């Protein structure tokens, strides 16, 4: 396997984020100066197979827009999955602290051009994403964001992928026929980005403020849906609106809000150069 490297050109430091991404360590690949990301796995444990499979996954996957994995070392007890650091962190966090004045309108429209690039290339790959959030999608240099690997399974048959018995998931970001049936299509991811363009948009907000969880369901299943937000284009909310049609047949595909959003992109960017 080509992927593999030997653990002692790894310098492990502390846990990243306060351990809100569980077991991953910021580290230093020693022969490149490079701060890396380690996802470790204690030997105590009955997910082995789990994370393996996550490796795998890995290995298949690449985009730019994608959290790319460096390496691995798989043959002595503690496993590590390397992938590359994003120095910003979580998407989520960034919008929260960040200047507006630097992370203006164009900005927005940028990182969800990436994320749903990124998202297209999952498409056409028979992936689904289980976690699709800004959360989850880790920031670098230059606004350069990129969606973590967390989360993603491949369609082995069908359209469906249906997550673990007993499963739990964020309320908030789940599209309502996985709530209700937890099945998982592309179409579920086009909802959940739907409500990323709306975190987005609001500068990392809570979706559904002062709605409560329980409330959720029987409120979408009756046409409920988020309002813009102020300074939201008309044309992001209406796009936002499409992601959340109730029926997932009805949600626009992923190479339709690529295209979309790369349109928009482009337009913002030649309406600002041509200002001057
Ligand atoms: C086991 N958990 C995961 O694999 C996971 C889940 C969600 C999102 C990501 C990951 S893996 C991961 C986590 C953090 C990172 C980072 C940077 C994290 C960070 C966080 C705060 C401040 C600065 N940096 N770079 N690359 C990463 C890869």
Not at 8 to 35: A, C, F, P
Not at 105 to 130: C, D, G, P, W
Not at 247 to 255: E, I, L, V, Y
Not at 257 to 276: C, G, L, P, Y
Request: some cysteine.
């Amino acid at each position: 396997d080509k992927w593999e490297m030997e653990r002692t050109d790894i310098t492990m430091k502390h846990k990243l984020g306060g351990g809100q991404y569980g077991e991953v360590y910021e580290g230093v690949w020693k022969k490149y100066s490079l701060t890396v990301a380690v996802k470790t796995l204690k030997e105590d444990t009955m997910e082995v197979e789990e994370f393996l499979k996550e490796a795998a996954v890995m290995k298949e996957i690449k985009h730019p827009n994608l959290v790319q994995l460096l390496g691995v070392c798989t043959r002595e007890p503690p496993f590590y999955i390397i992938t590359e650091f994003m120095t910003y962190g979580n998407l989520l966090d960034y919008l929260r602290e960040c200047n507006r004045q630097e992370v203006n309108a164009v900005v927005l429209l940028y990182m969800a051009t990436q994320i749903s690039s990124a998202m297209e290339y999952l498409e056409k790959k028979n992936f689904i994403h289980r976690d699709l959030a800004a959360r989850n999608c880790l920031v670098g240099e230059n606004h350069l964001v990129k969606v973590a690997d967390f989360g993603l399974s491949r369609l082995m048959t069908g359209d469906t992928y249906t997550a673990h018995a007993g499963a739990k998931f964020p309320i908030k970001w789940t599209a309502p026929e996985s709530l209700a049936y937890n099945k998982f299509s592309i179409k579920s991811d086009v909802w959940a980005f739907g409500v990323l363009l709306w975190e987005i948009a609001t500068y990392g907000m809570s979706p559904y403020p002062g709605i409560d969880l329980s409330q959720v369901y029987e409120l979408l299943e009756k046409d409920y849906r988020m309002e813009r937000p102020e300074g939201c284009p008309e044309k992001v909310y209406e796009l936002m609106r499409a992601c959340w049609q109730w029926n997932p047949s009805d949600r626009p595909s992923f190479a339709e809000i690529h295209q979309a959003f790369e349109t928009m992109f482009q337009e913002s960017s030649i309406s600002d150069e041509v200002e001057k």
